Ligand binder design. Structure first.
Ligand SMILES: [Mg+2]
Ligand SMILES: [Mg+2]
Ligand SMILES: [Mg+2]
Ligand SMILES: [Mg+2]
Ligand SMILES: [Mg+2]
Ligand SMILES: [Mg+2]
Ligand SMILES: [Mg+2]
Ligand SMILES: [Mg+2]
Ligand SMILES: [Mg+2]
Ligand SMILES: [Mg+2]
Ligand SMILES: [Mg+2]
Ligand SMILES: [Mg+2]
Ligand SMILES: [Mg+2]
Ligand SMILES: [Mg+2]
Ligand SMILES: [Mg+2]
Ligand SMILES: [Mg+2]
Ligand SMILES: [Mg+2]
Ligand SMILES: [Mg+2]
Ligand SMILES: [Mg+2]
Ligand SMILES: [Mg+2]
Ligand SMILES: [Mg+2]
Ligand SMILES: [Mg+2]
Ligand SMILES: [Mg+2]
Ligand SMILES: [Mg+2]
Ligand SMILES: [Mg+2]
Ligand SMILES: [Mg+2]
Ligand SMILES: [Mg+2]
Ligand SMILES: [Mg+2]
Ligand SMILES: [Mg+2]
Ligand SMILES: [Mg+2]
Ligand SMILES: [Mg+2]
Ligand SMILES: [Mg+2]
Ligand SMILES: [Mg+2]
Lengths: 96, 107, 67, 57, 223
RNA sequence: ACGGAAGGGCACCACCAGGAGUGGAGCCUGCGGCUUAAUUUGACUCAACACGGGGAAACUCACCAGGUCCAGACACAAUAAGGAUUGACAGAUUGAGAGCUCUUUCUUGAUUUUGUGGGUGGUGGUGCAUGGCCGUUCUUAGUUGGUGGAGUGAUUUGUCUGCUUAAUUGCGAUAACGAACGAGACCUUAACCUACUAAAUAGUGGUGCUAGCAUUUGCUGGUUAUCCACUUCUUAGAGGGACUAUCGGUUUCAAGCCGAUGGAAGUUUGAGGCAAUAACAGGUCUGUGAUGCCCUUAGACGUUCUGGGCCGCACGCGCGCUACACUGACGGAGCCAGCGAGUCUAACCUUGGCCGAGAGGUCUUGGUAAUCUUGUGAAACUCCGUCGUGCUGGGGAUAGAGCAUUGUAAUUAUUGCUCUUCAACGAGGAAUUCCUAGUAAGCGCAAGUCAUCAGCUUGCGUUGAUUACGUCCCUGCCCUUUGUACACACC
């Protein structure tokens, strides 16, 4: 899957922020909600990061569910030179 | 220095006909206990949502059909309450499964 | 063609077996007896149960019968 | 399986359920990151990170 | 709002199905046994019913944070519009789904078909249920698909008591050479119903009489 | 388990007695066959053939003729910052304003490529590898365990000659006694409430306000609240009600049955729903991101795009629709239902005012709905006429010419209207279907489908019979007995 590094950094950083991402199984969408790239660019970008063991996937009615793993966290943590314990999508907001 | 008149219509819709009916009358005089006049439980005709479909996934065997049913119940109540009980019977008014809807004056 | 089930027949004999002081030869009286003397689950069920006991008790005042 | 070794299977299943409820009854009496993500950029928003110039010739 | 309520009621009915399916799928390793959401124009409240909750929440609630954050974006609920809490299921061995998944993970670990099946049946019985039954269909090392039934106790199959006291759950366990079908049937104790009738209509219990003294020729006292 | 043996049954998917019919003809539709570049495919007694919800213009779509793309994850290696790879203006080319390919030469910068390994998808195969579902035995009545009797034992008795039942439903007989699944119970729906709870989103009476004719005060309406009362109608909550009741007839005067009265109701109250054990190489890999294995995978069986096909037509079969008329067609006019549906990021159901022969157009409004569309003023049907027994005005195939609507696209004519053309068909051989009470049959309506398309289906009400109220003759299936060398069980 070929894509400009800029469109890949958008989704790549979005995962570190929220820790999880969803996407409908519908190519020809031409743009993702909550993201500024084509839905197609996202799905097999994730499934690529999935084949590496960095994220777990599921389908459940044609919507993709991705959860970042305890091992992939470090992978992207060095993609923008994030610091140790910069942020997981694991911080209780106030008292949850 | 509050509690003006309301002109309220509380129309409740749900599928559970014993859980919506217990909270239906749970408020039938949870207002009359506080002596508010009212036009009580109004029962619109129950709604029958039918689904007729062949049982086989394929088109083999005897042409056996199967009708499914879903029944809906929506009850509206016109009240005579104050401007601070607006949110009193709003939270323990519920039972999982009953859609609550409160309305405003006739215009 | 309605032969009563032996569920009701088994019940009718088991009550006439211990309630002849009570259990008058009338259905309505016997019907309101079961709601208080039995733990039946439905009107229709107890209706044939009581309606049967009546026929049995109506015949005992004629002679004896099995059960 | 087969009906010849069933007994050793039935009692092993009996002994099986024994362990499942043993844990069930046993689980009745049993016993950060001072950085941010959405605000790490709002914090690391410092200047001296780019140099723009264009429109030559 | 903005729609008809018959469409609304069927709409959230579909919603419950989509949810329950997604839950049985993502976290099945925790004995998930169904969910339900509460109607409240306060928040939206779905309660997970698994058998190992601490695993559902994760490190200081890290993973439920993940799980909650996911269902949020499917229906794009504004952050805060919904949150879910994990509630362990009381005596899991009465609700079929729990035991159905139990065998799935038992056969998947190499247990003998008869041994694993018989285990859950004796467990479900000593767990309270009035009756139980489990059927295993498909092929197990034999090209021809067989089917064995395992049942204990009492089990009604006709009429309405079925919908009241029997909990069924099927599960396709995908093994090395095929797809095995697992079906579970648990008969809840009717007397212990706690909501609704507490005996099948068949039950007709008569309260027996007592002391019948002799005539004891008339006497009467005053007060 | 089976038999091409014997005895008993049950049933309009069996007859009896009848009804309305198919089969005959025209069209509609499916199946075969044939034809074709393709005419995609499943299925072939009941249990394939208006079935795959299968009413295909693109899609659907699986087929055929052609054109694109990788969405070939991940791993190693190779190429490679002198550039791995990306893209396009015009031009030739092309169905094509596809940089597919080419010419020219700018571009992009490590995201690809190449190789291998490994995957990925497919409506490719295998339903004779499976799940699951479903269809059939089954308009059925079967299964089982406790204590006891028999047997060395597998087993049997229980679980039965007869009688009754829709029912292994009971009576009765009884080495068996007493029970459970399944039948019953149960659940849902249609029928009964002037008794309970009351509702301008349901309706009634009075009264205002209001209009016509008659007068004598009346009769028939208008009135989104003018007020007042009520719950019979309407609605849906809670109860009650039937239990075959009473009496009688019949019978081991047992289960039961039958007649009469009463009764909302006395055919399991009518109709459903559910439904045990087993059985099938039944159908479904063309619903499934359910799946085992096999096939293919970059000139693709992936995928999309353009067009064609599934409709193709010497014929054979099947589910249908319209008729052959006078219990009619037509024209005025009378003019009554019920089950449903229905528009938010929207184009759904549509009243009403005009324009238009029509179809339709157009201008606004109600409605997320017991509130508006709608009393769905539906159709048969009732009434008053024209027609006159002659293919006639019955009939409406085929066909020409025009106007509309759906839609990116209507040619092989999507559908609607208009004029004209006016077939076969004069009651259907041998054969065979469905059915017993608000049923049959006639009648239209909603819903599914659906942009448009019902001659289909699923429900509904509308008008409303005949003849049964019986038998085992036909047919089918059960159950005994019985033979069996079959047990992979007569394939
Ligand atoms: Mg009591
Ligand atoms: Mg039943
Ligand atoms: Mg008979
Ligand atoms: Mg008969
Ligand atoms: Mg005949
Ligand atoms: Mg005939
Ligand atoms: Mg392309
Ligand atoms: Mg490769
Ligand atoms: Mg390879
Ligand atoms: Mg597939
Ligand atoms: Mg085949
Ligand atoms: Mg099969
Ligand atoms: Mg199968
Ligand atoms: Mg019959
Ligand atoms: Mg012995
Ligand atoms: Mg026998
Ligand atoms: Mg009333
Ligand atoms: Mg009478
Ligand atoms: Mg076959
Ligand atoms: Mg399948
Ligand atoms: Mg095409
Ligand atoms: Mg076809
Ligand atoms: Mg047919
Ligand atoms: Mg006429
Ligand atoms: Mg004109
Ligand atoms: Mg509006
Ligand atoms: Mg003529
Ligand atoms: Mg004509
Ligand atoms: Mg005829
Ligand atoms: Mg339609
Ligand atoms: Mg159809
Ligand atoms: Mg023999
Ligand atoms: Mg033979």
């Amino acid at each position: 899957m070929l894509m400009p590094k800029e469109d890949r950094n958008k989704i790549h950083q979005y995962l570190f922020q929220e820790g999880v991402v969803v996407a409908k199984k519908d190519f020809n969408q031409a743009k993702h909600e909550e993201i500024d790239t084509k839905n197609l660019y996202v799905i097999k970008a994730l499934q690529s990061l999935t084949s590496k063991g960095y994220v777990k996937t599921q389908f459940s009615w044609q919507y993709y569910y991705y959860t970042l793993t305890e091992e992939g966290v470090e992978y992207l943590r060095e993609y923008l030179n994030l610091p140790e314990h910069i942020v997981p999508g694991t911080y209780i907001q106030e008292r949850n | 220095q509050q509690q003006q008149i309301i002109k309220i219509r509380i129309t409740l819709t749900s599928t559970k006909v014993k859980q919506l009916e217990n909270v239906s009358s749970n408020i039938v005089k949870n207002a009359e206990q506080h002596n508010l006049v009212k036009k009580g439980p109004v029962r619109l005709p129950t709604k029958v949502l039918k689904i007729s479909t062949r049982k086989t996934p394929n088109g083999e065997g005897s042409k056996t059909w199967e009708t499914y049913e879903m029944r809906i119940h929506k009850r509206y109540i016109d009240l005579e309450a104050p401007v601070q009980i607006v949110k009193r019977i709003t939270q323990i008014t519920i039972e999982p499964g009953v859609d609550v809807e409160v309305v405003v004056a006739s215009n | 063609g309605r032969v009563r089930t032996k569920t009701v027949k088994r019940a009718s004999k088991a009550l006439i077996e211990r309630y002849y002081p009570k259990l008058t030869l009338d259905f309505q009286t016997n019907k309101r007896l079961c709601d208080e003397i039995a733990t039946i689950q439905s009107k229709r069920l107890r209706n044939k149960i009581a309606g049967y006991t009546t026929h049995l008790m109506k015949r005992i005042q004629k002679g004896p019968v099995r059960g | 399986g087969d009906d010849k070794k069933e007994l050793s299977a039935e009692k092993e299943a009996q002994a099986d359920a024994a362990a499942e409820i043993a844990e069930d009854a046993a689980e009745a009496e049993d016993a950060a990151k001072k950085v941010e993500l959405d605000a790490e950029r709002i914090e690391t928003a410092e200047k001296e990170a780019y140099v723009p110039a264009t429109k030559v010739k | 709002a903005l729609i008809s309520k018959k469409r609304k009621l069927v709409a959230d009915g579909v919603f419950y199905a989509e949810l329950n399916e997604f839950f049985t799928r993502e976290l099945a390793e925790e004995g998930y046994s169904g969910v339900e959401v509460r109607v409240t124009p306060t928040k939206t409240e779905v309660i997970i019913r698994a058998t190992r909750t601490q695993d559902v929440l994760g490190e200081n609630g890290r993973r439920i944070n993940e799980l909650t954050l996911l269902v949020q974006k499917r229906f794009k609920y504004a952050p805060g519009t919904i949150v879910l809490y994990a509630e362990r299921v009381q005596d899991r061995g009465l609700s079929a789904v729990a035991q159905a998944e139990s065998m799935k993970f038992k056969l998947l670990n190499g247990l003998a078909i008869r041994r694993a099946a018989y285990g859950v049946v004796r467990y479900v019985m000593e767990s309270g249920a009035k009756g139980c039954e489990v059927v295993v269909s498909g092929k197990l090392r034999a090209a021809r698909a067989k089917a064995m039934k395992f049942a204990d106790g009492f089990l009604i199959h006709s009429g309405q008591p079925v919908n009241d006291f029997i909990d069924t759950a099927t599960r396709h366990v995908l093994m090395r050479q095929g797809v095995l079908g697992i079906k579970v049937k648990i008969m809840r104790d009717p007397a212990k119903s706690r909501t609704g009738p507490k005996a099948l209509p068949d039950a007709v219990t008569i309260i027996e009489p007592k002391e019948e003294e002799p005539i004891l020729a008339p006497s009467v006292k005053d007060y």
